[PDB]
Design a protein around this ligand. Sequence first.
Ligand SMILES: CN[C@@H]1CCc2c(ccc(O)c2O)[C@H]1O
Length: 281
Amino acid sequence: VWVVGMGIVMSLIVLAIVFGNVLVITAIAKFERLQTVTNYFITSLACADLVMGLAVVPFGAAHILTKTWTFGNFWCEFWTSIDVLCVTASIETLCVIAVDRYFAITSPFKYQSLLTKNKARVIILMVWIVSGLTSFLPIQMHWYRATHQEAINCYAEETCCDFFTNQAYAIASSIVSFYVPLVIMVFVYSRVFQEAKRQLQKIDKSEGRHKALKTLGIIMGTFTLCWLPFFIVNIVHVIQDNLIRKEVYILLNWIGYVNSGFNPLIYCRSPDFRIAFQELL
Ligand SMILES: CN[C@@H]1CCc2c(ccc(O)c2O)[C@H]1O
């Protein structure tokens, strides 16, 4: 008397993700005044989130609802690889946007020389290649498998599918995809906030007669809350196997997926975006 209800929530999640990503992509694509060298990163992030919502979630619903991966054996590895690829691509695009903002604020005169139209394509291709190198290559030819007695049946059985790995790939992927972007973003945003506070203090010297922290807080806190616990538990369960059950792992992995749907609600609030959105509908 509970299976039917959760399907509604999952369908709403899918619909929200798809609608948001499609709306953002259409808005930036159709209207000329919105395209910008900085705005292409938003397009890449929206494309990655749309791919995640279209592929990962609808297929992942089978495990939750039917409790039986009735699909073929070859499909599960592809599904896992595309999921990890989408996650790492989204995280790296977020880090790239943060670095772009740091460069913009820190040096205005040198900003034009550093970044041009052709640079965006090169950097996005490089980041997508480095994101996909760690997803498809180590998974397709079975570098990630474990010699432990458990999951030998899982690879052997046709009806079973769950994520078990050896003690190299989990830690390598966690280091590549989570800790470095967090360090980079924390450093650049701390410097940006310090510069903004310095300017705000300087204004009051010439105006002889902080509410700007909210934007930084909303940018940092939602991402940290969404993604921090998952990689901590991912690191911890591998080193010692009996600490973490499967249900907690699945719940954290699922709550980590909702983050991609909230990026349009946080990263496109400019008046030009709102005007385009109003004009579309
Ligand atoms: C089964 N779900 C996967 C499992 C491991 C993993 C994920 C995402 C990014 C990574 O770097 C990972 O190593 C998860 O989405």
